[PDB]
Tab-separated table of C-alpha atoms in Angstrom:
chain	number	residue	atom	x	y	z
A	531	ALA	CA	0.019	-0.058	-0.049
A	532	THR	CA	3.175	2.235	0.195
A	533	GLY	CA	2.501	4.128	-3.143
A	534	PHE	CA	3.641	7.604	-4.191
A	535	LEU	CA	1.971	10.831	-5.302
A	536	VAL	CA	5.006	12.361	-7.017
A	537	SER	CA	8.183	11.145	-5.129
A	538	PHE	CA	9.735	8.768	-2.784
A	539	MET	CA	13.101	8.006	-1.100
A	540	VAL	CA	15.290	5.078	-2.230
A	541	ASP	CA	18.810	4.088	-1.395
A	542	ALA	CA	21.253	1.334	-2.465
A	543	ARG	CA	18.959	-1.192	-0.536
A	544	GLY	CA	16.834	-0.762	-3.674
A	545	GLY	CA	13.143	-0.214	-3.916
A	546	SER	CA	9.986	-0.593	-5.922
A	547	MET	CA	6.994	1.788	-5.841
A	548	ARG	CA	3.649	2.349	-7.543
A	549	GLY	CA	1.705	5.567	-8.128
A	550	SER	CA	-0.840	5.649	-5.533
A	551	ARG	CA	-3.066	7.751	-7.845
A	552	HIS	CA	-2.173	5.494	-10.584
A	553	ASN	CA	-1.427	1.815	-9.658
A	554	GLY	CA	-0.187	0.906	-13.262
A	555	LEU	CA	2.593	3.628	-13.026
A	556	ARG	CA	5.478	1.926	-11.541
A	557	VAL	CA	9.024	2.660	-10.723
A	558	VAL	CA	11.534	-0.111	-9.841
A	559	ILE	CA	15.031	0.843	-8.491
A	560	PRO	CA	16.845	-2.525	-8.012
A	561	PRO	CA	19.542	-3.018	-5.427
A	562	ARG	CA	22.957	-1.213	-5.988
A	563	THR	CA	21.656	0.877	-8.839
A	564	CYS	CA	22.233	4.281	-7.088
A	565	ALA	CA	25.183	5.250	-4.906
A	566	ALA	CA	23.464	7.112	-2.008
A	567	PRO	CA	19.965	8.026	-0.905
A	568	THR	CA	18.201	9.559	-3.839
A	569	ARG	CA	15.077	11.390	-3.982
A	570	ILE	CA	13.095	10.153	-6.989
A	571	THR	CA	10.289	12.250	-8.402
A	572	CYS	CA	8.072	11.167	-11.251
A	573	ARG	CA	5.580	13.720	-12.538
A	574	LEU	CA	3.046	13.554	-15.261
A	575	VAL	CA	2.889	16.721	-17.167
A	576	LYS	CA	0.438	17.966	-19.752
A	577	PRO	CA	1.977	18.567	-23.224
A	578	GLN	CA	0.560	22.121	-23.234
A	579	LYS	CA	3.210	22.998	-20.658
A	580	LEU	CA	6.322	22.370	-22.745
A	581	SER	CA	7.954	25.060	-25.006
A	582	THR	CA	8.829	22.332	-27.503
A	583	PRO	CA	6.259	19.465	-27.283
A	584	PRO	CA	7.247	16.390	-29.312
A	585	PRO	CA	7.106	17.174	-33.104
A	586	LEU	CA	4.299	15.337	-34.595
A	587	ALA	CA	4.091	13.616	-37.997
A	588	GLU	CA	0.876	13.282	-40.034
A	589	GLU	CA	-0.789	10.124	-38.438
A	590	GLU	CA	1.244	10.370	-35.280
A	591	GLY	CA	-0.194	10.905	-31.765
A	592	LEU	CA	0.631	10.978	-28.106
A	593	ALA	CA	-0.443	8.063	-26.062
A	594	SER	CA	0.489	9.261	-22.614
A	595	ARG	CA	1.162	12.619	-20.770
A	596	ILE	CA	4.766	13.914	-20.766
A	597	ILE	CA	6.733	11.955	-18.045
A	598	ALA	CA	9.268	13.783	-16.036
A	599	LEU	CA	11.501	11.533	-13.805
A	600	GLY	CA	13.920	13.241	-11.471
A	601	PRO	CA	16.373	14.393	-10.640
A	602	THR	CA	16.894	15.298	-14.321
A	603	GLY	CA	20.265	14.055	-15.411
A	604	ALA	CA	20.631	11.390	-12.806
A	605	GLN	CA	22.989	8.605	-13.753
A	606	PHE	CA	22.451	5.102	-12.249
A	607	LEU	CA	25.228	2.368	-12.106
A	608	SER	CA	22.917	-0.052	-13.962
A	609	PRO	CA	19.501	0.101	-15.552
A	610	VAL	CA	16.233	1.023	-13.839
A	611	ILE	CA	12.607	0.073	-14.730
A	612	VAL	CA	9.838	2.553	-15.098
A	613	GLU	CA	6.371	1.215	-16.288
A	614	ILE	CA	3.971	3.927	-17.775
A	615	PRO	CA	0.270	3.444	-18.536
A	616	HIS	CA	-0.745	4.590	-21.951
A	617	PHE	CA	-3.939	4.928	-23.961
A	618	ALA	CA	-5.343	2.620	-26.493
A	619	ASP	CA	-2.637	0.821	-38.296
A	620	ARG	CA	0.159	1.837	-35.902
A	621	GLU	CA	2.932	1.245	-33.280
A	622	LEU	CA	4.236	2.269	-29.759
A	623	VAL	CA	7.519	4.308	-29.502
A	624	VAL	CA	9.134	5.786	-26.443
A	625	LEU	CA	10.682	9.205	-26.967
A	626	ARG	CA	12.848	11.076	-24.528
A	627	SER	CA	14.431	14.490	-24.333
A	628	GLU	CA	17.665	15.057	-22.441
A	629	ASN	CA	17.041	18.789	-21.951
A	630	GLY	CA	13.423	19.621	-23.273
A	631	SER	CA	14.483	20.938	-26.775
A	632	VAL	CA	15.226	17.784	-28.889
A	633	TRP	CA	13.245	14.532	-28.976
A	634	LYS	CA	14.775	11.054	-29.840
A	635	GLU	CA	13.629	7.457	-29.749
A	636	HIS	CA	14.504	5.297	-26.818
A	637	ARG	CA	14.700	1.442	-26.624
A	638	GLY	CA	15.373	-5.645	-23.171
A	639	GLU	CA	13.623	-8.959	-22.406
A	640	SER	CA	15.975	-11.673	-20.989
A	641	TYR	CA	17.802	-8.782	-19.203
A	642	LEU	CA	14.859	-8.883	-16.603
A	643	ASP	CA	16.267	-11.559	-14.300
A	644	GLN	CA	19.588	-9.942	-14.396
A	645	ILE	CA	18.898	-6.241	-13.840
A	646	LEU	CA	16.627	-6.871	-10.827
A	647	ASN	CA	19.931	-7.809	-8.969
A	648	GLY	CA	18.123	-10.302	-6.756
A	649	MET	CA	15.055	-8.184	-5.971
A	650	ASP	CA	11.999	-10.181	-4.922
A	651	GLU	CA	9.621	-8.526	-7.374
A	652	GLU	CA	7.272	-10.085	-9.829
A	653	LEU	CA	7.592	-8.274	-13.215
A	654	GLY	CA	4.971	-8.970	-15.689
A	655	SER	CA	5.247	-10.790	-19.124
A	656	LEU	CA	5.471	-8.325	-21.999
A	657	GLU	CA	2.280	-9.812	-23.305
A	658	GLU	CA	0.446	-9.059	-19.957
A	659	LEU	CA	1.576	-5.458	-20.188
A	660	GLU	CA	0.184	-5.092	-23.700
A	661	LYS	CA	-3.288	-6.294	-22.486
A	662	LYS	CA	-3.290	-3.794	-19.580
A	663	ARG	CA	-1.509	-1.208	-21.893
A	664	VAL	CA	1.482	-0.367	-19.967
A	665	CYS	CA	4.959	0.341	-21.453
A	666	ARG	CA	8.202	-0.805	-19.753
A	667	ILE	CA	10.943	1.749	-20.190
A	668	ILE	CA	14.334	0.426	-19.044
A	669	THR	CA	16.886	3.197	-18.634
A	670	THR	CA	20.112	3.809	-16.748
A	671	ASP	CA	19.483	7.451	-16.543
A	672	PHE	CA	16.668	10.029	-16.349
A	673	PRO	CA	16.100	12.523	-19.152
A	674	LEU	CA	14.061	15.501	-18.525
A	675	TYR	CA	11.090	13.961	-20.349
A	676	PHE	CA	9.994	10.603	-21.686
A	677	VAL	CA	6.610	10.268	-23.635
A	678	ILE	CA	4.679	7.404	-25.243
A	679	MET	CA	3.587	7.879	-28.874
A	680	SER	CA	2.030	5.880	-31.595
A	681	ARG	CA	3.122	6.008	-35.353
B	1459	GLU	CA	-61.914	58.862	-12.347
B	1460	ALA	CA	-62.068	55.592	-14.399
B	1461	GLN	CA	-60.815	57.808	-17.342
B	1462	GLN	CA	-57.828	58.728	-14.851
B	1463	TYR	CA	-57.272	55.024	-14.062
B	1464	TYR	CA	-56.621	54.190	-17.798
B	1465	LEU	CA	-53.921	56.865	-18.080
B	1466	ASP	CA	-52.227	55.721	-14.892
B	1467	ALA	CA	-52.394	52.075	-16.159
B	1468	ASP	CA	-50.990	53.149	-19.496
B	1469	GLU	CA	-48.196	54.973	-17.783
B	1470	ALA	CA	-47.285	51.986	-15.516
B	1471	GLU	CA	-47.301	49.740	-18.541
B	1472	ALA	CA	-44.854	52.051	-20.479
B	1473	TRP	CA	-42.627	52.331	-17.433
B	1474	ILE	CA	-42.485	48.505	-17.185
B	1475	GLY	CA	-41.800	48.187	-20.823
B	1476	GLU	CA	-38.975	50.785	-20.582
B	1477	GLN	CA	-37.324	49.111	-17.749
B	1478	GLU	CA	-37.473	45.730	-19.162
B	1479	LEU	CA	-36.295	46.425	-22.690
B	1480	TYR	CA	-34.155	49.433	-22.245
B	1481	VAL	CA	-32.956	49.999	-18.625
B	1482	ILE	CA	-32.069	46.525	-17.645
B	1483	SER	CA	-29.175	45.090	-19.677
B	1484	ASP	CA	-27.928	41.638	-21.053
B	1485	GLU	CA	-24.415	42.711	-21.236
B	1486	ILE	CA	-21.871	40.218	-20.137
B	1487	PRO	CA	-19.020	41.337	-17.881
B	1488	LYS	CA	-15.491	40.459	-19.306
B	1489	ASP	CA	-13.717	40.480	-15.946
B	1490	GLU	CA	-14.183	40.935	-12.139
B	1491	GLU	CA	-13.965	44.750	-12.325
B	1492	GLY	CA	-16.537	44.778	-15.222
B	1493	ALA	CA	-18.681	42.423	-13.259
B	1494	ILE	CA	-18.618	44.699	-10.027
B	1495	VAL	CA	-19.476	47.719	-12.038
B	1496	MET	CA	-22.449	45.859	-13.819
B	1497	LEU	CA	-23.759	44.447	-10.527
B	1498	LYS	CA	-23.531	47.704	-8.635
B	1499	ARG	CA	-25.510	49.202	-11.557
B	1500	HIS	CA	-27.931	46.397	-11.612
B	1501	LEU	CA	-28.787	46.412	-7.960
B	1502	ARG	CA	-29.794	50.177	-7.969
B	1503	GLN	CA	-31.952	49.483	-11.042
B	1504	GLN	CA	-33.518	46.632	-9.132
B	1505	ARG	CA	-34.201	48.739	-6.104
B	1506	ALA	CA	-35.958	51.096	-8.477
B	1507	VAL	CA	-38.225	48.252	-9.752
B	1508	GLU	CA	-39.132	47.057	-6.213
B	1509	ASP	CA	-39.864	50.729	-5.313
B	1510	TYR	CA	-42.208	51.067	-8.175
B	1511	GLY	CA	-44.295	48.184	-6.617
B	1512	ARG	CA	-45.987	50.860	-4.358
B	1513	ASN	CA	-47.260	52.507	-7.485
B	1514	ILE	CA	-48.663	49.217	-8.731
B	1515	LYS	CA	-50.302	48.088	-5.403
B	1516	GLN	CA	-51.992	51.438	-5.071
B	1517	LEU	CA	-53.365	51.084	-8.665
B	1518	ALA	CA	-54.815	47.660	-7.828
B	1519	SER	CA	-56.372	49.231	-4.796
B	1520	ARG	CA	-57.989	51.819	-7.042
B	1521	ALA	CA	-59.152	49.168	-9.659
B	1522	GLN	CA	-60.634	47.246	-6.671
B	1523	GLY	CA	-62.431	50.240	-5.311
B	1524	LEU	CA	-63.829	51.158	-8.833
B	1525	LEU	CA	-64.900	47.453	-9.296
B	1526	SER	CA	-66.470	47.107	-5.801
B	1527	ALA	CA	-68.364	50.522	-6.273
B	1528	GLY	CA	-70.090	48.890	-9.373
B	1529	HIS	CA	-68.461	50.998	-12.139
B	1530	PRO	CA	-69.973	50.404	-15.589
B	1531	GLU	CA	-66.432	49.378	-16.884
B	1532	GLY	CA	-65.410	47.396	-13.751
B	1533	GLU	CA	-64.631	44.204	-15.696
B	1534	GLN	CA	-62.542	46.113	-18.267
B	1535	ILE	CA	-60.683	47.927	-15.370
B	1536	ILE	CA	-59.939	44.763	-13.337
B	1537	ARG	CA	-58.533	43.002	-16.370
B	1538	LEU	CA	-56.139	45.937	-17.147
B	1539	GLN	CA	-54.996	45.602	-13.531
B	1540	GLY	CA	-54.439	41.839	-14.003
B	1541	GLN	CA	-52.338	42.668	-17.224
B	1542	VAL	CA	-50.360	45.277	-15.240
B	1543	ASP	CA	-49.853	42.917	-12.229
B	1544	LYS	CA	-48.722	40.346	-14.626
B	1545	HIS	CA	-46.283	42.657	-16.475
B	1546	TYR	CA	-44.844	43.883	-13.302
B	1547	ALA	CA	-44.302	40.240	-12.061
B	1548	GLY	CA	-42.548	39.452	-15.324
B	1549	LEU	CA	-40.208	42.415	-14.771
B	1550	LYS	CA	-39.352	41.454	-11.242
B	1551	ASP	CA	-38.380	37.974	-12.450
B	1552	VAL	CA	-36.220	39.221	-15.222
B	1553	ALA	CA	-34.479	41.508	-12.772
B	1554	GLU	CA	-33.968	38.666	-10.332
B	1555	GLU	CA	-32.626	36.404	-13.118
B	1556	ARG	CA	-30.182	39.148	-14.086
B	1557	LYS	CA	-29.082	39.635	-10.530
B	1558	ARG	CA	-28.618	35.800	-10.176
B	1559	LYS	CA	-26.517	35.874	-13.474
B	1560	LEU	CA	-24.288	38.803	-12.494
B	1561	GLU	CA	-23.622	37.386	-8.952
B	1562	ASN	CA	-22.625	34.055	-10.680
B	1563	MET	CA	-20.230	35.652	-13.154
B	1564	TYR	CA	-18.845	37.907	-10.412
B	1565	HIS	CA	-18.017	35.148	-7.812
B	1566	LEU	CA	-16.722	32.979	-10.366
B	1567	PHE	CA	-14.120	35.587	-11.461
B	1568	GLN	CA	-13.039	36.016	-7.868
B	1569	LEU	CA	-12.667	32.487	-7.248
B	1570	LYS	CA	-10.672	31.967	-10.617
B	1571	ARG	CA	-8.293	34.738	-9.585
B	1572	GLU	CA	-7.831	33.365	-6.103
B	1573	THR	CA	-7.338	29.827	-7.267
B	1574	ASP	CA	-4.780	30.991	-9.954
B	1575	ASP	CA	-2.768	32.924	-7.360
B	1576	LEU	CA	-2.704	29.967	-5.113
B	1577	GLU	CA	-1.818	27.469	-7.843
B	1578	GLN	CA	1.049	29.720	-8.904
B	1579	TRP	CA	2.244	29.997	-5.301
B	1580	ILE	CA	2.243	26.230	-5.058
B	1581	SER	CA	4.168	25.914	-8.243
B	1582	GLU	CA	6.863	28.298	-6.830
B	1583	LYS	CA	7.077	26.384	-3.481
B	1584	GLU	CA	7.682	23.277	-5.620
B	1585	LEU	CA	10.824	24.698	-7.222
B	1586	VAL	CA	12.335	25.359	-3.858
B	1587	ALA	CA	11.304	21.813	-2.842
B	1588	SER	CA	13.069	20.428	-5.953
B	1589	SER	CA	16.479	21.834	-5.253
B	1590	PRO	CA	19.307	19.238	-5.607
B	1591	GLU	CA	21.714	21.238	-3.418
B	1592	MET	CA	23.213	18.696	-1.065
B	1593	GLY	CA	25.808	20.791	0.626
B	1594	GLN	CA	29.630	20.435	0.719
B	1595	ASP	CA	30.492	19.916	4.390
B	1596	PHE	CA	28.651	19.181	7.731
B	1597	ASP	CA	28.092	22.824	8.590
B	1598	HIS	CA	26.625	23.620	5.157
B	1599	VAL	CA	24.236	20.613	5.263
B	1600	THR	CA	23.365	21.654	8.839
B	1601	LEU	CA	22.469	25.019	7.335
B	1602	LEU	CA	20.423	23.642	4.443
B	1603	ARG	CA	18.762	21.154	6.569
B	1604	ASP	CA	17.711	23.784	9.147
B	1605	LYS	CA	16.727	26.352	6.424
B	1606	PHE	CA	14.593	23.783	4.693
B	1607	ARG	CA	12.906	22.835	7.839
B	1608	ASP	CA	11.934	26.442	8.410
B	1609	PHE	CA	10.753	26.530	4.825
B	1610	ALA	CA	8.625	23.418	5.187
B	1611	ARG	CA	7.037	24.805	8.327
B	1612	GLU	CA	6.241	28.351	6.968
B	1613	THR	CA	4.883	26.851	3.797
B	1614	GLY	CA	2.770	24.174	5.605
B	1615	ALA	CA	1.325	26.824	7.891
B	1616	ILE	CA	0.597	29.607	5.304
B	1617	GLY	CA	-0.457	27.098	2.650
B	1618	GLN	CA	-2.885	25.059	4.539
B	1619	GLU	CA	-4.809	28.163	5.636
B	1620	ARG	CA	-4.930	29.425	1.946
B	1621	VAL	CA	-5.983	26.000	0.818
B	1622	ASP	CA	-8.702	25.910	3.598
B	1623	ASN	CA	-10.053	29.329	2.565
B	1624	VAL	CA	-10.366	28.412	-1.111
B	1625	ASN	CA	-11.990	25.224	-0.181
B	1626	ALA	CA	-14.538	26.859	2.221
B	1627	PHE	CA	-15.264	29.437	-0.471
B	1628	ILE	CA	-15.732	27.020	-3.264
B	1629	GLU	CA	-18.153	25.093	-0.860
B	1630	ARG	CA	-20.156	28.276	-0.063
B	1631	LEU	CA	-20.758	28.770	-3.737
B	1632	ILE	CA	-21.948	25.360	-4.409
B	1633	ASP	CA	-24.158	25.345	-1.172
B	1634	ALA	CA	-25.855	28.490	-2.269
B	1635	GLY	CA	-26.321	26.941	-5.777
B	1636	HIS	CA	-24.193	28.164	-8.523
B	1637	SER	CA	-24.524	27.474	-12.208
B	1638	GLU	CA	-20.924	26.405	-12.637
B	1639	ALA	CA	-20.636	24.141	-9.681
B	1640	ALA	CA	-19.431	21.174	-11.863
B	1641	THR	CA	-16.463	23.313	-13.118
B	1642	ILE	CA	-15.793	24.777	-9.724
B	1643	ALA	CA	-15.527	21.264	-8.284
B	1644	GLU	CA	-12.841	20.241	-10.905
B	1645	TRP	CA	-10.935	23.305	-9.803
B	1646	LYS	CA	-11.240	22.165	-6.167
B	1647	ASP	CA	-10.043	18.750	-7.036
B	1648	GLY	CA	-7.001	20.242	-8.984
B	1649	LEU	CA	-6.090	22.472	-6.277
B	1650	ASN	CA	-6.336	19.929	-3.539
B	1651	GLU	CA	-4.142	17.447	-5.456
B	1652	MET	CA	-1.459	20.116	-6.030
B	1653	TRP	CA	-1.370	20.844	-2.403
B	1654	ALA	CA	-0.941	17.042	-1.599
B	1655	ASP	CA	1.822	16.875	-4.133
B	1656	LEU	CA	3.610	19.874	-2.710
B	1657	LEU	CA	3.480	18.528	0.818
B	1658	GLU	CA	4.889	15.183	-0.409
B	1659	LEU	CA	7.597	16.890	-2.397
B	1660	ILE	CA	8.442	18.890	0.655
B	1661	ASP	CA	8.575	15.763	2.700
B	1662	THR	CA	10.902	13.734	0.450
B	1663	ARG	CA	13.281	16.853	0.132
B	1664	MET	CA	13.392	16.824	3.862
B	1665	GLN	CA	14.144	12.992	3.975
B	1666	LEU	CA	16.908	13.547	1.277
B	1667	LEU	CA	18.437	16.281	3.518
B	1668	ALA	CA	18.184	14.115	6.758
B	1669	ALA	CA	20.092	11.457	4.971
B	1670	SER	CA	22.723	13.900	3.777
B	1671	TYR	CA	22.985	15.251	7.292
B	1672	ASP	CA	23.501	11.753	8.611
B	1673	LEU	CA	26.315	10.986	6.131
B	1674	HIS	CA	28.194	14.265	7.019
B	1675	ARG	CA	27.322	13.777	10.800
B	1676	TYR	CA	29.130	10.444	10.586
B	1677	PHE	CA	32.323	11.755	9.023
B	1678	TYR	CA	32.368	14.695	11.416
B	1679	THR	CA	31.939	12.273	14.345
B	1680	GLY	CA	34.795	10.043	13.040
B	1681	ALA	CA	37.173	13.084	12.951
B	1682	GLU	CA	36.192	14.105	16.530
B	1683	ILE	CA	36.785	10.510	17.744
B	1684	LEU	CA	40.266	10.268	16.142
B	1685	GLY	CA	41.246	13.504	17.986
B	1686	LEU	CA	39.812	12.045	21.077
B	1687	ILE	CA	41.766	8.729	20.852
B	1688	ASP	CA	44.898	10.705	19.872
B	1689	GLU	CA	44.357	13.041	22.867
B	1690	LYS	CA	44.130	10.162	25.276
B	1691	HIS	CA	47.077	8.251	23.577
B	1692	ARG	CA	49.361	11.184	24.107
B	1693	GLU	CA	47.992	11.485	27.682
B	1694	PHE	CA	41.667	8.229	33.330
B	1695	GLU	CA	40.622	4.557	33.838
B	1696	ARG	CA	36.894	5.540	33.438
B	1697	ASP	CA	37.379	7.970	30.571
B	1698	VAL	CA	38.678	5.342	28.205
B	1699	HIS	CA	35.832	2.880	29.036
B	1700	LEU	CA	33.488	5.923	28.235
B	1701	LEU	CA	35.333	6.799	24.929
B	1702	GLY	CA	35.017	3.103	24.411
B	1703	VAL	CA	31.350	3.268	24.549
B	1704	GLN	CA	31.340	6.208	22.040
B	1705	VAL	CA	33.361	4.096	19.747
B	1706	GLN	CA	30.901	1.199	19.993
B	1707	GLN	CA	28.119	3.627	18.933
B	1708	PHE	CA	30.210	4.754	16.001
B	1709	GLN	CA	30.720	1.187	14.894
B	1710	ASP	CA	26.819	0.606	14.926
B	1711	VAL	CA	26.197	3.773	12.930
B	1712	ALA	CA	28.729	2.605	10.288
B	1713	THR	CA	27.025	-0.654	9.604
B	1714	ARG	CA	23.477	0.887	9.386
B	1715	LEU	CA	24.805	3.567	7.078
B	1716	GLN	CA	26.504	0.944	4.886
B	1717	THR	CA	23.335	-0.746	3.731
B	1718	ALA	CA	22.240	2.577	2.249
B	1719	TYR	CA	25.331	3.368	0.148
B	1720	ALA	CA	27.339	1.498	-2.586
B	1721	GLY	CA	30.619	1.573	-4.404
B	1722	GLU	CA	32.998	4.592	-3.637
B	1723	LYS	CA	30.855	6.321	-0.981
B	1724	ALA	CA	30.080	3.056	0.959
B	1725	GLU	CA	33.750	2.355	1.099
B	1726	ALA	CA	34.743	5.732	2.371
B	1727	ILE	CA	32.327	4.887	5.159
B	1728	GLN	CA	34.046	1.643	5.846
B	1729	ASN	CA	37.472	3.139	5.606
B	1730	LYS	CA	36.607	5.676	8.191
B	1731	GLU	CA	35.032	2.964	10.446
B	1732	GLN	CA	38.269	0.872	10.160
B	1733	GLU	CA	40.596	3.848	10.653
B	1734	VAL	CA	38.671	4.590	13.930
B	1735	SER	CA	38.761	0.949	15.013
B	1736	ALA	CA	42.463	0.703	14.286
B	1737	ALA	CA	43.217	3.852	16.247
B	1738	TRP	CA	41.045	2.494	19.114
B	1739	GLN	CA	42.914	-0.873	19.221
B	1740	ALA	CA	46.326	1.008	19.371
B	1741	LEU	CA	45.049	2.748	22.512
B	1742	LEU	CA	43.832	-0.447	24.237
């Protein structure tokens, strides 16, 4: 029942947390992935707030709000897992922006058992995620923004 | 006298028509100011209408006197009076509706302004809450930690009041019955959510800073202990057992703290623990 509104503390003992407002929204920081106690923030921002919203091609569309994970710039020692819920011919693509001005594409499977570093957490099958409509972003660092789009 | 009634009735009718089509207005205020002006003007106009009621009642009284006296045109006269009464009632409604509209637009402008100032204030408090600044030494972190505590408190106190006030206000509008109550409610929800987020952001920032304080407090304590071991070494039976207890505590702190860090930082913690232990053994 320990969920977060917008942030939570985590140290090298690792930790996993779900949005209390949004259960599907999940952050997993596996043991040994950050050097010290770190304050993780995860905020869902409306597109209308950016000065450079993700450029949109003809049949392209956003499938989630902008996702800001903090602190911006944070480097982890290995990768971290963030699961983002998204909304329902075309294809899911995660985009990220290091500083808010340029957007690029971001992109595991067998890595799962490894990157958890021994954590007793029951990650879903990629197929179960598709049914519930959640994206799994694996990253070793936080850019200013991540977003989910469909092309 | 009946002849006189007709003129009076025509006069009242014309006055009602004039107030309804030409004096009262449909204009829609663009802003709070505009609304206040329009409301102030409307209320005087409405006092005028209510005040005219005396004229109308008096006329009915005459139409009734002229009817009960058995005037030849008593049926004609009592009808005109019914028509006047009706038209007057129509004007009072139209005036009341207008009043209801202006109050709604006005109040809503106030609330919107007060909500906006508050949401902005919250947005500002959040930036202070997001600072990464961890502080270079123990005295610096002590400073940040103490400064942020004061900030968390001043913000909690002032903010909760302002939040409460906007909430009570929003509720009063809804309880009095407002045309925009569905929209006002979304505002309350949005505002209350931001507040909760701010209080959480404040809280994690505080936890971050407590942890940072602990790390610097440890290293500071290590330095003090080394000096205390050294002081005694250069130098009673009881003092050493006591310094010994202080050492045992430091040993416990080092292990607890270790679980939280990894790599370079965690080692620095272990190095300093052993350094202290080694120094301690030399003394014993």
